[PDB]
Symmetry: C3
Subunit: 295 residues, 3 copies
């Protein structure tokens, strides 16, 4: 048997099909079994429409055997395109051996596995092309768009393997596919899922700036608007200031800015380096939470 | 030498260039030698225009040595995008070892080989991503479009390897490329070719329904039109009925419907499962042949 | 460690980031260290804008360690999309082991390496799909477009690995990436670079014809215009003549014509085969240099 063939076969039981249907519409995606109690991680875009209109939508999980089981939404994070589902009392569930995204290196061979019984399902092969690559992601519906610090791959990520796992050559999940190919790393996923499972919510830092990218001789995220009462207006950030370092992550554009704000601690003090009218200023800002009552 | 390099070299003699030229136009594609008598299988789109206008077009086969030999059309099937050519009295022809498409598994490494002396020829690599995947295919010219139950691959199928073979790691033809990558499986090809060689024609079942896809909570192929005298109008199929199983192949959309009708036996009785006004009806239809005089 | 992972790691020190910036703009690409004196080969499109407007642009080379060093343009060839840069007094430079593009075969596994510290950098994997494939290339700015006799690959060539090397499985540069994937072969690069280093210029043959492609029953490069005083008008080439062989390279279209003219010797006599009004004429032309004073 093939080396790639042995690995895809070893994980197909852990990959499931997610089907959300209404009276007149239906969406479909893939997901992965992470916990034996019945916890299934997928993307947020796949189920976005079951959550914004639950009175008319119903979500079911189809396993490798064709067994179709109703599912309930545990929690969802539109800012990491992640989501957790739960099926109840289902047994003999083959859980996925999750790996460490910190040991992944560029050039390692991977497999973007989709759900075996999915309609347009796909199993693609490639390598890890880049690590810690910010990527803009379009938010489905009322949801907000976001930027994620992702694992890039030349394996094709598409509608047939989105929400399924990025698998290494030891059959371990090192990322979650999102729909040249980008994946949400497993180390961020294990953290988002723990909070989504225990609380039904994940709280993320906010500063209150909108940014546009700039690249010349002076490069980073240029300020478009500072909100009133925002931690940024209190910290001294001004319109048309250029941010080049947030906390300790240097920032090359607006996309890396979004990623670096999420890496800050809420309510702790953070250095923010700015170039204003040709002078270097290092300000200090305390990040607010995006949902106070839930923090 | 490379593992992929050894395999592409072992099959290049069996892959040929097909050149169809008129006074002011010229098409080009790839093909494969399947029989030592000089039988060459290609796609139907490649030669479509030599067959609909033969008085002005001429088709020649260019071998690996640059030897250019006139060719004649044995038969063609627009519904499987397949076609057979014959060169006469050419000797020392290296025939392709044809494999079994039923032993192919997802994740097996493949090679989409094009014709060595072709203009924009390409040799691409990848894996088998999906099996038994219906795919719509655009029919060139007066020809009809069709849907084929195909082998999907992430190896790029394009103008430079269409009509050439999908090769496994034992240098065996497991499919015929058609122009993310789809291939006509060798087991369907061996059957279509046998009929095209012995009869110059292949007869396929027809029922007389036009279908549009639907996906909601009730999913399959919805009836748009039933022809008069069609086996479907006789079997009781009605407009706005939803087909979910044809024969014994469940049907998820209009594309799988087209594929499942071709799997029925002509003149034999076939169960057809339909959901009408929220009620489940199982009808019975006898498939007609698309060409009576030839059946 | 992975087999592809070991190879990309072994060459990352030789691959550098090239950054050209003005007051309001900035371009970025990749390059490769070919000589220990500090000679760096990239594409011409990457630096095109530092050369046409040098009073406002500044080019710097960023190494694997983040060490940022100013760079100077040695020479550039818009017709092979090649360019040479020089950094001065930098030591401990890890040079790339350059290979032989004449020993490369179709199906050999390759890696399209980009600059590690580049913004949108990518490391892609694939195989050599075709050899000696002419490809049109769009010239940036005032520069002219060209056609190059290239190494085609299914590894994705993009903004993140353009100018970086095409690497074989022995970690040797067999080509230079240019932005389904095409690369400038190392054997042409070693020649262009030697002239660009020693002279700051490369002189290429010209004949003075503009050509459009034609394919029918008679195929090659059709003449659109012959310039006055051009070696072609002196050699007898006429408008609406069809060129099928230049020197000893047969020509299938206008793109291979461009490639074959560059293979001729300047000031030497060359056979040019033409089909005119259905008759075969073999003319004789002496190629001029594109820059006389520099030849």
């Amino acid at each position: 048997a093939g080396r790639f063939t042995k690995v895809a076969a070893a994980v197909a039981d852990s990959v499931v099909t997610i089907e959300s249907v209404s009276d007149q519409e239906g969406m479909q995606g893939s997901g992965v079994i992470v916990d034996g109690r019945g916890y299934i991680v997928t993307n947020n875009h796949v189920i976005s429409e079951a959550a914004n209109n639950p009175s008319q939508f119903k979500t079911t999980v189809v396993f490798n055997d064709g067994k179709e089981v109703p599912a309930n939404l545990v929690g969802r994070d539109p800012k990491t395109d992640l989501a957790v589902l739960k099926v109840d009392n289902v047994d003999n569930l083959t859980v996925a051996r999750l790996g460490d995204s910190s040991k992944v290196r560029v050039g390692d061979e991977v497999l973007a596995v989709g759900a075996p019984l999915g309609l347009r399902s796909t199993v693609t092969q490639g390598i890890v092309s880049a690590l810690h690559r910010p990527v803009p992601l379009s938010g489905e519906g009322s949801d907000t768009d976001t930027v994620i610090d992702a694992i890039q791959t030349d394996a094709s990520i598409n509608h047939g393997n989105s929400g399924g796992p990025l698998i290494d050559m030891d059959a371990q999940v090192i990322g979650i596919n999102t729909a040249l190919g980008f994946a949400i790393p497993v180390n961020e996923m294990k953290l988002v899922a723990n909070s989504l499972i225990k609380d039904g919510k994940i709280v993320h830092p906010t500063l209150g700036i909108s940014t546009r990218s700039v690249s010349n001789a002076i490069s980073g995220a240029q300020v478009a608007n500072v909100k009133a009462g925002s931690p940024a207006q209190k910290g001294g950030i001004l319109e048309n200031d250029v941010i080049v370092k947030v906390g300790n992550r240097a920032v090359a554009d607006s996309d890396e800015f979004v990623v670096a704000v999420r890496q800050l601690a809420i309510g702790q003090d953070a250095p923010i380096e700015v170039v204003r009218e040709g002078r270097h200023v290092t300000l200090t800002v305390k990040p607010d939470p995006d949902s106070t009552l839930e923090h």
